[PDB]
Every structure is written in C-alpha cells, then in structure tokens.
Amino acid sequence: PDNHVYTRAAVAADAKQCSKIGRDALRDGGSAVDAAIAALLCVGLMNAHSMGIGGGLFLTIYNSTTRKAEVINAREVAPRLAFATMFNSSEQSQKGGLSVAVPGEIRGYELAHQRHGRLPWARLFQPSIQLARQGFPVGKGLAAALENKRTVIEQQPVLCEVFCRDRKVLREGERLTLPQLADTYETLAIEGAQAFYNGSLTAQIVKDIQAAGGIVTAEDLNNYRAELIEHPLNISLGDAVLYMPSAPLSGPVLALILNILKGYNFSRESVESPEQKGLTYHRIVEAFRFAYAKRTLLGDPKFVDVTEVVRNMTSEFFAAQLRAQISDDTTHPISYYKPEFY
Amino acid sequence: TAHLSVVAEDGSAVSATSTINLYFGSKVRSPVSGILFNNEMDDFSSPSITNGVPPSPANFIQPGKQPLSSMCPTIMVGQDGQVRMVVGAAGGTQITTATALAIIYNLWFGYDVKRAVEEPRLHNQLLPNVTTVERNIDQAVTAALETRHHHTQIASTFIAVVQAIVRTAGGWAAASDSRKGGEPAGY
Ligand SMILES: *[C@@H]1O[C@H](CO)[C@@H](O)[C@H](O)[C@H]1NC(C)=O
Ligand SMILES: *[C@@H]1O[C@H](CO)[C@@H](O)[C@H](O)[C@H]1NC(C)=O
Ligand SMILES: *[C@@H]1O[C@H](CO)[C@@H](O)[C@H](O)[C@H]1NC(C)=O
Ligand SMILES: *[C@@H]1O[C@H](CO)[C@@H](O)[C@H](O)[C@H]1NC(C)=O
Ligand SMILES: *[C@@H]1O[C@H](CO)[C@@H](O)[C@H](O)[C@H]1NC(C)=O
Ligand SMILES: *[B]([O])([O])[C][C][C]([N][C][C][N])C([O])=O
Ligand SMILES: [Cl-]
Ligand SMILES: [Cl-]
C-alpha cells in the first residue's frame, strides 16, 4: 500500500498505529520531539509489555538548525532506601514491589517537550487517550508477549483484569481496552508532569508499589530529575559522525565494536563469497567479545568515575590494539579478551 | 523495550529507546492508575549470583543510582550536517549487537534499510560464553563459525527488534521490524 520511502518526513515505530499517530503529529506542525513523545504514549499502550510511563528512557536528538546533537537522560533510579545487598536471588530482583525502580519516562517527556515542543502538552496525549478507552486489536508483538507469560498473567487477577478474556490471555486480533491508564493519561495531559511526581497521582503510586513490597517513597518521586547531556558520545565513521549516549548506556560498547570493525574496511565484497562472508562474520563476533570484555567496568558516571575507561573504549588506538589480537581462524577462551572489573 | 526513529521535515531527528525492563516489568499493575511498573532493579549487579556475569562492583546498587543499560539510541550525521541514519534496537540484552549489525548491513554491505532491518542476526556477549544465531541465518556463516571453534546454538524466537530510517537521494527510507510486526508512516 506504501513504499515506505518518504519525501519529507518519517516515523518508524514497532506498531503501525503509533507510527501514524507520530506522522499525524508532524502534519499538524509538530517537531520531531512532539511526534516522538506522541508515539511513545501510543507504544506504552499498544506494546504494554515493552515500555510505558512505569519505566524510563533515553532520547538522542539532533537539531538541524543548530547543527547539534544532544542526549536526554530519563532512566529509572534506585530508591533512597535501596542498598547493595537487598537481593539474594533472581526471583527477588525480577518480581514484586522491590524489583521496582523510580519511573522516569514522564520527566523525560517534559524536558524534551520543554526544549523542542511546538504542540501543546495535552495534544500529545489526545490520540492515545482515545485508543485506551475505545480499545484496539492485539498485534503480533504483544500477542507473543502474552503467550510467553500466560501463567504469571492468568494467576494474577490485577493483570488478568485488563489482559485476559474469560481469564485467558488475549490472542492476536482480540480487543484490549485500558480503562484505568486512559484516565491516568488524561490527568497527565490536563494537570501535567507534576501530577505524577508531586501531584494528584503520587500517593497512589507509593501505595501501589509498597503494597507489593517495594520501598519507593514520595520523596523518591518528588526528587527525580531528568538530565540534559549537552555533549553526547560520538565516533567518526569515514565520512560521518555517530551520536549515542555514554554510560550508563551502551554507547561506549557500540563505539568499540564499530571502531574495531571499521579497520577491516567492510564492503559489498565482504559478503560476495562464503569464504569472505565467513571471515567477516567471525570478525564481527570477535569484536563483540572484545567490546563486551570491557563493559564490566561501567556504571552510573555520577557514582563511579568512568571518564578514562570511556575515553579508552572509544579511543582509536585502543580499538587498534584489540583488532590485532583477533585471529582469523579461531575464537578464544574468555580469559583471552582480558575482561576487567577494576 | 521499544525503540523508534523519527525524521522531521526540517531535517531534525530523534532516536528513542524506552523500557520497563522484562516483559510486563515487575508484574505489578496498579488497580487504580493502571500503571504497569519496571523491574529495572534486575539490571544492577549483586555481590551474589550469576545470570553469567560475576559480581561487577561498578554496577552494584546504591541509593539514587542508575542501573547500567544495554540500550543505545543512535543518530548518524554527514559532514555536511545532514542526518544520514536514525537507528536503535530493543529486546533482552541483544540491543547493542543488533544496532551494530544494522549499521554494518547498511553502511558497509550496502543493504537497503528494509533489508538492513530484516537480515538474520547473531549475538555473542562473552559472558555467558555462547554464540547465538537466528534460525534463517546463512548456513555458510554457521559453518565458518563452527570450524573456527565457535559453539553455536539457534535462537528459539528471534534476536532483537530494529527500527531505522536512512537518508537516500530519493528521500527518507524507513523500516520497522517484522519480527515484532510494526510498520512505519510518513509523507
Ligand atoms: C537478602 O539478604 C540480605 C542480608 O541478609 C538482606 O539485606 C535482605 O533482607 C534479603 N533480601 C531478600 C529480598 O531476600
Ligand atoms: C533547536 O534549538 C532551538 C534553540 O536554539 C529551539 O528553539 C528549537 O526548538 C530546536 N529545533 C527544533 C526543530 O526543535
Ligand atoms: C566528540 O566527543 C567530544 C565531546 O565533547 C568532543 O571531543 C567532540 O566535540 C565531539 N564531537 C562532536 C561532533 O560533538
Ligand atoms: C587504557 O588503555 C590502556 C592500553 O592501551 C590500558 O593500559 C588501560 O588499562 C586503559 N585504561 C583504563 C582506565 O582502563
Ligand atoms: C567458550 O567458547 C569457546 C567455543 O566457542 C571455547 O573455545 C572456550 O573454551 C569456551 N569457554 C571458555 C571458558 O572460554
Ligand atoms: B529491553 O526489554 O530489551 C530491556 C533492556 C534493559 N535491560 C536488559 C537486561 N535484562 C536495559 O538494559 O535498559
Ligand atoms: Cl488500564
Ligand atoms: Cl522496539
């Protein structure tokens, strides 16, 4: 029905409906940021297993006017009451109140909109609110999610309330309706981001989290700040520059993978024969390994000094050092890539 | 996890990645607000067990602290300051490998943006010590790894979800990942 090559603007989301919402936000004169936020709200509804206002995020944004990129940081934080030894198992760190970090998504949206928005706040929420009350058919992605977690969903009434039909998980095509989130979204549109963090919604969040055994308090919410990063991580790739977020995200690692690999000068020919394709793909995996080796040194750069670690990871020579240790005809033991921890 | 790419008419762009962590997060949904919460604490390291990766002190929990993430939302820009690519990925821990493969398939192998997004993927993150491949990978690739002593194993489902937009002389080319079933929009 469509070539997916566009003359002026494009939105690529993991659900058609959210892509449209995005595009329609541009048509009505919204910026990239406006279209972005607008689409993510759609995505937190249509792919509810993936992301949403109960989470956190990162946004990389290029300003064509100022010819500059930036990063906005809205990943979740550990509660004031959290401590290093608070878990003793996987089971404990993955289910219930305690496995919940302080959500960031909403402060994220606010700052991005406060800096690059052209449409009103409430405009962004509008089509998602409609979608939530009316309901929509379940798409492939959320269908498999449901199937994958059938048992944990059906055995929990509060999930099954929205996610089951006759106490069985919804299947692809069946109608999902999200009545409680729609009200929520509407309160956010009217009252603003304040409603979530220090507002009409705050106490309910605390109670919900704590009732299931978390330790998140009002103070956590009240204090959460999204963060503007003026100088994102960058790497040179021939004619071009790549922008990406530094730690706590995986920019450094992707920087290393690509910096290692750009030294083989890959071309069309790298895959034109099985002989060369095999080698190419081997090199790729080895670079992964070498890059993952160094990952284990990374953390919040507000807590751990990783300044030099990152400068290294993205260094031109550091990359050249590891490339020379790649053998064309074999992989290696873990030890070989010198994974470090201090 | 979800990623999306965006290109506005004025040539500005956003790469965005968002997550509640694992499928359905902590599996707590408010009966009042309907808000479904993240299990992002899982992403810190413990001084206890392996998932895998031994205790890594730079990622231990502290109050007010951000867990290390696998996510990498990216934008490539020409020397002439015009946007050339907006890409990223989502899905378990295969985010950073898939993103790189997407960039490589387009930038170096010369694949169109849709092929870049659909092309079979592979993954190794060192810890743990296995190379994983998608079920419809080129089998000559499999053999080449298996004879350079890689112990491969096929993925049951698929590796990651990629949303990209590339600049072409014909305009903006876009693709959403069929593995998760999205489609793009534009004008
Ligand atoms: C884990 O053990 C530590 C030390 O005994 C303690 O702080 C905590 O109560 C335990 N947490 C869980 C979730 O079992
Ligand atoms: C670029 O930055 C300016 C401020 O210098 C801001 O007003 C504008 O919103 C940004 N451009 C876009 C397209 O958002
Ligand atoms: C790349 O990284 C650092 C961040 O300040 C700096 O050397 C350089 O200006 C950056 N490049 C660009 C194009 O921002
Ligand atoms: C930087 O790289 C050098 C090798 O080129 C290495 O000695 C050192 O461990 C690296 N620095 C850090 C802080 O990891
Ligand atoms: C890891 O995998 C490779 C096989 O691909 C093997 O050579 C190596 O011995 C394995 N184990 C360790 C601990 O490195
Ligand atoms: B997303 O569902 O792909 C999850 C990404 C998240 N944690 C992955 C490790 N379980 C992250 O690192 O932000
Ligand atoms: Cl709901
Ligand atoms: Cl996605």
Last-in-domain residue among A231, A253, A270? A231
Last-in-domain residue among A189, A208, A231? A231
Q: Is A87 in the pocket of ligand 1 (CB under 6 A)?
A: yes
Residue type for A148, please?
N
With H, G, I as helix, E, B as strand and everything else as coil, classify residue B56: coil
The answer on A214 and A181 residing in a single domain is yes
Where exactly are the structural domains of chain B?
A: 1-187
Residues B119, B101: contact at Cβ < 8 Å? yes
**φ and ψ of B90, to 5 deg:** -145, 160
With H, G, I as helix, E, B as strand and everything else as coil, classify residue A62: strand
The answer on A184 and A321 residing in a single domain is no
Alpha-carbon distance of A164 to A178, in angstroms, equals 12
The answer on A247 and A267 residing in a single domain is yes
Alpha-carbon distance of A315 to A179, in angstroms, equals 51
Alpha-carbon distance of A40 to B128, in angstroms, equals 32
The answer on A315 and A202 residing in a single domain is no
The answer on A152 and A105 residing in a single domain is yes
Q: Whose CA is nearest to atom 8 of ligand 3?
A: A234
Using alpha carbons, select from B134, B38, B30 the residue that is nearest to residue A74. B38
- Say how many domains are in chain A: 2
Q: How far is the CA of B2 from the centre of ligand 6 (A)?
A: 10
Q: Which of B1, B17, B99, B132 is catalytic?
A: B1
CB atoms within 10 A of CB A228: 13
Q: Which residues in chain B have Cβ-Cβ distances shorter than 8 Å to A39?
A: 4, 6
Q: Whose CA is nearest to atom 5 of ligand 2?
A: A66
What letter would DSSP give residue A11? E
Alpha-carbon distance of A337 to B158, in angstroms, equals 27
The answer on A245 and A224 residing in a single domain is no
Residues B93, A306: contact at Cβ < 8 Å? no
Q: Are strands B152-154 and B131-133 parallel, antiparallel or unpaired?
A: parallel
Q: What is the DSSP string of A16-81?
A: HHHHHHHHHHHHTT--HHHHHHHHHHHHHHHTTTT--TTSEEEEEEEETTTTEEEEEEE--B--TT
| Ligand 3 atom showing the smallest separation from residue A234 Cα | 1
Cβ of A100 and B28 within 8 Å?
yes
Q: Which residue blocks in chain B are alpha helix, DSSP H?
A: 95-107, 113-118, 139-147
Residues A186, B33: contact at Cβ < 8 Å? no
Active-site residue, B74 included? no
Sheet of B131-133: strand order equals B122-123, B131-133, B152-154
Residues A35, A19: contact at Cβ < 8 Å? no
The answer on A219 and A267 residing in a single domain is no
Q: Whose CA is nearest to atom 6 of ligand 5?
A: A333
Alpha-carbon distance of B17 to A58, in angstroms, equals 6
Q: Which residues in chain B have Cβ-Cβ distances shorter than 8 Å to A86?
A: 61
Mutate to test the pocket of ligand 1, among A81, A88, A98, A100 (most ligand atoms within 8 A of CB): A88
The answer on A256 and A194 residing in a single domain is no
Experimental method used, please?
Answer: X-ray
Alpha-carbon distance of A62 to A37, in angstroms, equals 15
CB contact, 8 Å: B57 with chain A? yes
| Ligand 4 atom showing the smallest separation from residue A317 Cα | 5
The answer on A164 and A44 residing in a single domain is yes
Range of the domain at A276: 232-342
CB atoms within 10 A of CB A240: 15
Alpha-carbon distance of A134 to A177, in angstroms, equals 6
Residues A340, A297: contact at Cβ < 8 Å? yes
The answer on A238 and A307 residing in a single domain is yes
Cβ of B186 and A103 within 8 Å?
no
Residue type for A5, please?
V
Residue A117 distance to chain B (closest CA, Å):
12
With H, G, I as helix, E, B as strand and everything else as coil, classify residue A47: coil
Residue A29's Cβ-count burial label (10 Å; 0-12, 13-18, 19+) is exposed
Give the E-state strand segments of A156-212 in sequence order: 175-176
| Ligand located closest to A47 CA | 8
Using alpha carbons, select from B126, B114, B60, B104 the residue that is nearest to residue A303. B60
Resolution of the experimentally solved model in angstroms: 2.3
Q: How far is the CA of B48 from the centre of ligand 1 (A)?
A: 11
The answer on A240 and A216 residing in a single domain is no
The answer on A318 and A216 residing in a single domain is no
| Ligand located closest to A315 CA | 4
